[PDB]
Design a protein around this ligand. Structure first.
Ligand SMILES: Nc1ncnc2c1ncn2[C@@H]1O[C@H](COP(=O)(O)OP(=O)(O)OP(=O)(O)O)[C@@H](O)[C@H]1O
Ligand SMILES: Nc1ncnc2c1ncn2[C@@H]1O[C@H](COP(=O)(O)OP(=O)(O)OP(=O)(O)O)[C@@H](O)[C@H]1O
Ligand SMILES: Nc1ncnc2c1ncn2[C@@H]1O[C@H](COP(=O)(O)OP(=O)(O)OP(=O)(O)O)[C@@H](O)[C@H]1O
Ligand SMILES: [Mg+2]
Ligand SMILES: [Mg+2]
Ligand SMILES: [Mg+2]
Lengths: 316, 316, 316
DNA sequence: TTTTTTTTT
DNA sequence: AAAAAAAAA
């Protein structure tokens, strides 16, 4: 995709181009999707440079009203990534859609952190297999990124492990304000390359800790909203899917609607329920088989799939 | 591992270095994994000192995107500690993995407090035996730390008791807010030395008491989450394993899923189920033989091992 | 042991010292083992007084990480109290260990309320006999504290009855919320004196009644946990043993594990099974001889002893 | 917006 | 074989 260098020949001459890049801006799209107010906060582009930069960036491409069908076409390069269990891919429409945020929340031992590895391995398969020719970005917020698992699943999928463990990029976010730093940089590698999905285990494992009590709740939800917006924007201007794992909390309140089943009601509140495009609840079933329920999708209606997490990732 | 003195020659000059250390910060890593907001709460580093400190600490080492394989390598120094029963070490992949939290929960007389002593003794064995060249930190929240047992097990393992009883460090946490104080200090001794595992008998024996009733539940779960995060962080930036013993509660609710077996459903809720990387349920079997079931691991799938707690710790 | 007056000369000046004492706090240790939150609920020490009090109390003594061996030494003053039947004292390691909770549960006529008298009398013997130079605290929750029995056993042990019946302190708890009141006060007499063991016949004889039905079960288990924690703490900061008698319930459920022997499964649930350090089951044998089985100890493994309750207490 | 607890006969 | 109740930042 065109970089922030194409407009370098429009008067934007790269004296401050280093300034721009340092700010994270690497593509042209990211120049259009950045508010002026935020662009005049990078210490060296005050007012007029930003006006000329925006005039240029708009001269490259236009954002008006593509009627509806040029959209349906531009919407054809979605690369629905397979999850590994035919039933689930069928209930989701083929798998994890790209240029969108897909969230998975359930109590422990539901393998919602194993679906991450299954995707990490099943994204490097030819398009006619479910994924395709894509690297992966992985942001771990609770550890548990065992590459041994990646190699096991690769071998089980008839694929050179060494190869796959090379197309993955790993980053161990340490605290919330570092997790948010990471996405900015991530805006770079996605500028030139083939990244299909970004993965965030426990999107809120950190925020749950850096902000404790309803004394600092609002300041947490606001940071979380900014973080989720940055993601949803990346996943959109790079045709990249986003996969977030979430957690569950128990409601010590009433015994209605209905009487039981506490392993629900994810954490994050509404700021995260809205931002997520697809929601999925993973529940424990019988023996070693779990139930995946769809709860919020714009394409599908609803259903319940059953899947067993075996030795080749998520299957049945 | 490098201390917080290496950057002392970067402008951080140690005028306030005592301030920093008093705050618990002893290594450089701990400087990177501490949010600014929390660092400007130590009464003497307001804004700019923290900025320069972070610039320095980042100048020493980088945290970007190690692709995947440098990870698989850096992940090679795991020191899987043996538990003492070949079958169990085989079901866990070799034993208690380091840089991770392993939880063990079951009803009384399951010796989940005896596995602690068995580890305390079996951590000081050459790596080719299961542990290796490591001291031990022990935080007792219910008493029952009989060093006599440590000496008995040592003698049974052909090892100088006096020696082992010297490489152990003991602390009797008195109340929750003291148990949480202890880990901060513990951040110090782990700065320079050879500590392999930290042990916490009844991670929640105290929290269960300092906060009674669902009137103060949330305020308990939040403190517990902070405490568990601090641990998981220590165990990660020091290549040290963490071993927590938990307790069991009975569900006076329905008679489904299935009809019986009440000695399950540990306490702590979900805040502790997520934070734990490995879960293990210890159940009473026949005669003097117990059954260890694995329930949540990122490496293994699942299995049931059988072990007898004899006079040399946990064996068969 | 040092009182709460030693720190009186640290700024804590005794203006509110009466406030502190009224709260039960009499020693310094009890000041360290009391959470701040609970200390700012005594109506006259809000925030700063508690901070200075804790600073002082910590200035007297330190609680860090005594490595392991200073522990094995400080653990040398255990005063294992003899029970009266050589076989039982041998199966327990010498008798009832101090600074620990020992529970005894069995069906009626097992004399689990006679072992209480036997201890009451066999605690005032020179250390080389099994007990030693200790008064006794007795909390009766079902009556049946016949001092005549105490005098009979004393005479049988070659000891001045009048003397022993003076070193005993008796309290007839009337209801649960009074039984819990009693331990607080008890925290006083143990401040200055020689008390070796505390005794509680039917630790749950009252709780079984003040809270009926699973509608108020949780509120009963929580109070019981608080009560047991207070005990375990007293028994620890005063080198005093605790001896609890329990009761038995019958399981109208299945006929497995194995088919019979209903006189087991004590009451109290798990909140009491964990808190107890040593468990013992008293069963009826042949003629006038009972069988004592050990079930949960941190020192011993396991065994079955046989003892006959004769006219000199518990013997064979 | 956050946060589960507790066997009896 | 069949039994519920518990708040507070
Ligand atoms: N190769 C394997 N290694 C480890 N576990 C496996 C393997 N194959 C299957 N499993 C099983 O699959 C399940 C995986 O759980 P999973 O990783 O989804 O937990 P999680 O929900 O991601 O973690 P948490 O909920 O604690 O964040 C476990 O029950 C595990 O035992
Ligand atoms: N040397 C020994 N000393 C004491 N008990 C032993 C010994 N060897 C084996 N045992 C037995 O092993 C078991 C140990 O129980 P364990 O210490 O695991 O209880 P726990 O579950 O840790 O304690 P709790 O559940 O009360 O927190 C007991 O049944 C005990 O009798
Ligand atoms: N001097 C004595 N006076 C009374 N009974 C005695 C005496 N000596 C021996 N016994 C016998 O020893 C046994 C004592 O029973 P014990 O006092 O242990 O009952 P308990 O289990 O404590 O009470 P409960 O189970 O009702 O709470 C009885 O069988 C009793 O007849
Ligand atoms: Mg997980
Ligand atoms: Mg124990
Ligand atoms: Mg009795």
């Amino acid at each position: 995709i065109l970089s922030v260098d194409e407009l370098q020949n429009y008067g934007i001459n790269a004296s401050d181009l280093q300034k721009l890049k340092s700010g994270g801006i690497y593509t042209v799209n990211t120049v259009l999707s950045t508010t002026r107010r935020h662009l005049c906060k990078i210490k060296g582009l005050s007012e007029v440079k930003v006006e000329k930069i925006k005039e240029a960036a708009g001269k490259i491409i236009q954002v008006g009203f593509i009627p509806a069908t040029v959209q349906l076409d531009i919407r054809q390069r979605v690369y629905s990534l397979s999850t590994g269990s035919k039933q689930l891919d069928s209930i989701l429409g083929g798998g994890i859609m790209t240029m969108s945020i897909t969230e998975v929340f359930g109590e422990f031992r539901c393998g919602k952190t194993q679906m991450s590895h299954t995707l990490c391995v099943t994204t490097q398969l030819p398009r006619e297999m479910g994924g395709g020719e894509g690297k992966v970005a992985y942001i771990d917020t609770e550890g548990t990124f065992r590459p041994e698992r990646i190699k096991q699943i690769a071998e089980g999928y008839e694929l050179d492990p060494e190869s796959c463990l090379a197309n993955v990029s790993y980053a161990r976010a340490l605290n919330s304000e570092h997790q948010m730093e990471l996405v900015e940089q991530l805006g770079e590698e996605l500028s030139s390359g083939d990244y299909r999905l970004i993965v965030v285990d426990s999107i809120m494992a950190n925020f749950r800790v850096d902000y404790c009590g309803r004394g600092e709740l609002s300041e947490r939800q606001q940071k979380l909203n900014q973080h989720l917006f940055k993601l949803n924007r990346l996943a959109e201007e790079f045709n990249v899917a986003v996969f977030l794992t979430n957690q569950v909390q128990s409601d010590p309140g009433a015994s209605a609607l209905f009487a039981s089943a506490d392993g629900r009601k994810p954490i994050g509140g509404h700021v995260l329920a809205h931002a997520s495009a697809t929601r999925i609840l993973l529940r424990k079933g019988r023996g070693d088989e779990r139930v995946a329920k769809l709860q919020d999708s714009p394409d599908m209606p609803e259903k319940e799939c059953v899947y067993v997490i075996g030795e080749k990732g998520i299957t049945d």
